[PDB]
Curated annotation (Swiss-Prot), chain A:
This is Small ribosomal subunit protein uS15. It comes from Escherichia coli (strain K12). HAMAP family: Ribosomal_uS15_B (MF_01343_B). The gene is rpsO. SUPFAM superfamilies: S15/NS1 RNA-binding domain (SSF47060). GO terms for molecular function: rRNA binding; small ribosomal subunit rRNA binding; structural constituent of ribosome. Keywords: Ribonucleoprotein, Ribosomal protein, RNA-binding, rRNA-binding, Translation regulation. The lineage of its organism: Bacteria, Pseudomonadati, Pseudomonadota, Gammaproteobacteria, Enterobacterales.
From Swiss-Prot, chain B:
The gene is rpsB. Keywords: Ribonucleoprotein, Ribosomal protein. Coiled coil: none annotated. Part of the 30S ribosomal subunit, contacts bS1. Some nascent polypeptide chains are able to cross-link to this protein in situ. In collided ribosomes contacts ribosome rescue factor SmrB. This is Small ribosomal subunit protein uS2. HAMAP family: Ribosomal_uS2_B (MF_00291_B).
Swiss-Prot record, chain C:
Part of the 30S ribosomal subunit. Contacts proteins S5 and S12. Gene3D superfamilies: 3.30.1370.30, 3.30.1490.10. InterPro entries: Ribosomal_uS8 (IPR000630), Ribosomal_uS8_CS (IPR047863), Ribosomal_uS8_sf (IPR035987). This is Small ribosomal subunit protein uS8. Keywords: Repressor, Ribonucleoprotein, Ribosomal protein, RNA-binding, rRNA-binding, Translation regulation. Belongs to the universal ribosomal protein uS8 family. One of its GO terms (biological process) is cytoplasmic translation. It comes from the Bacteria. Signal peptide: none annotated. One of its GO terms (cellular component) is cytoplasm. It comes from Escherichia coli (strain K12).
Amino acid sequence: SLSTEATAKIVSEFGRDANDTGSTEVQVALLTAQINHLQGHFAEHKKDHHSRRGLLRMVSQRRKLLDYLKRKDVARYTQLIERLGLRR
Amino acid sequence: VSMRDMLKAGVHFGHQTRYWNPKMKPFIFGARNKVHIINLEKTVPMFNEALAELNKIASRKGKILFVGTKRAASEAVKDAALSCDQFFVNHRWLGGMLTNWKTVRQSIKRLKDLETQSQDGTFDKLTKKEALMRTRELEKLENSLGGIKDMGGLPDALFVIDADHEHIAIKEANNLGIPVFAIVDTNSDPDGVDFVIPGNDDAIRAVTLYLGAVAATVREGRSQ
Amino acid sequence: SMQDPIADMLTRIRNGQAANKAAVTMPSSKLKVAIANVLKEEGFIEDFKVEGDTKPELELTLKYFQGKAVVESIQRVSRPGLRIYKRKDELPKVMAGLGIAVVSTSKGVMTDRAARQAGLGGEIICYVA
RNA sequence: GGCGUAAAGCGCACGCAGGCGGUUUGUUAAGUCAGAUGUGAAAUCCCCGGGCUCAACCUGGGAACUGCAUCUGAUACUGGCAAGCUUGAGUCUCGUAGAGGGGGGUAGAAUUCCAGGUGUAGCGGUGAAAUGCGUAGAGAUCUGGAGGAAUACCGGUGGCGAAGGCGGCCCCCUGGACGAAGACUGACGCUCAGGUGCGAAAGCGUGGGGAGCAAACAGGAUUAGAUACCCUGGUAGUCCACGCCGUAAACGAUGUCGACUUGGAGGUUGUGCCCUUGAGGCGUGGCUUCCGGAGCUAACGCGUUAAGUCGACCGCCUGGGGA
């Protein structure tokens, strides 16, 4: 998974505090970082279905978090999807 | 009945924690060295109520049937039931002594006829082969039905030791509506009994204490 | 997941009655407290208390008569998958009147005969016989 | 009304539409409820009478027409809206166990083959035989080499994985689960038609590889026959890379999620406490095996890992053949 330092950096830049590790923005950012990191692993290991299942779990969890955020506050949703480079 | 005498007699002791019956949870005080300890504060009032009901049954022209067949409580049950003009089953309980009384009545008649023709009759037509045969049949029939020969009918109350060991007698008494007074240990089933007396039923001094108390109360009931 | 807490309360009561439990505890709620009030005033449970402030815990004291269950039957009628509403002229009577039917009328949660005397209908919460 | 065995749980999972949804406050009055109004043609149905000499029949009045719309109120529940809350659901910290997956390397035992030494008449196989190999030197034994496949002991109603499945050792990449104490977000949840993905073995396509085993095939037996079982060989295949296939008694013949309900003995993996006496005792989680209580079941049996008591959603069944 992500190292401790990368996780701390993401939590700091995406959270309202250094301890706000549960915010929707922090969770979506961590999931996006893990997906982007896994992208390179699966480019080389196209036959790793067992890990791709966890990758798809991460993708679906990020999708549900983004849906909840868009339904809750669309402004933060837009800021997040522009800061992370989403929307296909 | 005295909780000091009870605790000195070994009543509070129970079986190991594995063999316990969860229905005996209200009467269990705790555990020490993986054996259950019966709550004597629960034991003494239930024993007193059972003794009161036994005294009522005795004073109201009743017949008590003392049931216990373990090698620990056989002779004790015999002594207790003979000490108060009562009846006992201190050896194997024949399946159907109560529910099938119309059939064991014939065996009682046979035992009585054999013992009368042996003692008072004194046939002396021995043949030295049918005589020993008849004496062995008489001793078997007496070891089986020696306690209830003078009962006449069904009793009015059963006093059972080791309610788990005597489940057949309890089920028969329940089928016939006879109240059951049973010493229910931590491993026995207290469902089929009317007056459950939670106490140790394996130690000899505990069962002698129970039987002495019951004999005293049924004698005071007999003498009104 | 937990999608019907009222049916959960009824099931807890039924299972505690079948297991000869002295009292049953559960997470509290306004509707649960109203139904427990209706059950207590009708004589199906002994008492009930709500403990806790941030996470209230409702505790019902079950009732027995002859070593037997006082609540013989308790069923959820209106449920999330199928809501059941009745008018005052078609309010149900359980056990031909010996049982009660907890009804949620616009004047609070009450029994079926109380809602009938009040000239009201509403959602049939449960049947208690 | 059902789906363990009688017909019936998709092989497994992710997930859009849909269905359902913890808890508090306020508001609305859409569902819901109450009242009123309008309407609900007549006949028919039903009730009390009347006339046909009775009946059928005719007929007066009533009830009914369980419905729809409108208007006025109620606010408990469901819904909408707004603000919350932490117990459901997730994130972070530190560790733990594991044949979880993908890639590369390597080790030993054994089979087969090639070359050579010793050595001589058998070997192999079977119920018994024969086919087969062998005086061109087999089998046995010893030495060296080649190649492929699978990993003895550990090893275990043991472990991991959604399922299918996963077993030498090492390294690289990587998923999930669990536990301790906290912090964080604040219903973000459950299920899921269609959809997508994974999916034993066999099989197919292309390119390799090929020791052992072995469909087809050949021969020897057995037999009345023997297109078989048995024996001697043996091609595809089994192995690798990449695609396809999408099926299994894909089984727990038992869909997923959540709550509640007496116990006993174990296994495995964390964690806490105590002169730790000890490989100790006492708690507390996760997964797991056997027995068994109430209950349930046609019975067998299931039984806190339910086939018990419930809730949400989905799939499926409607006599046997045809099929």
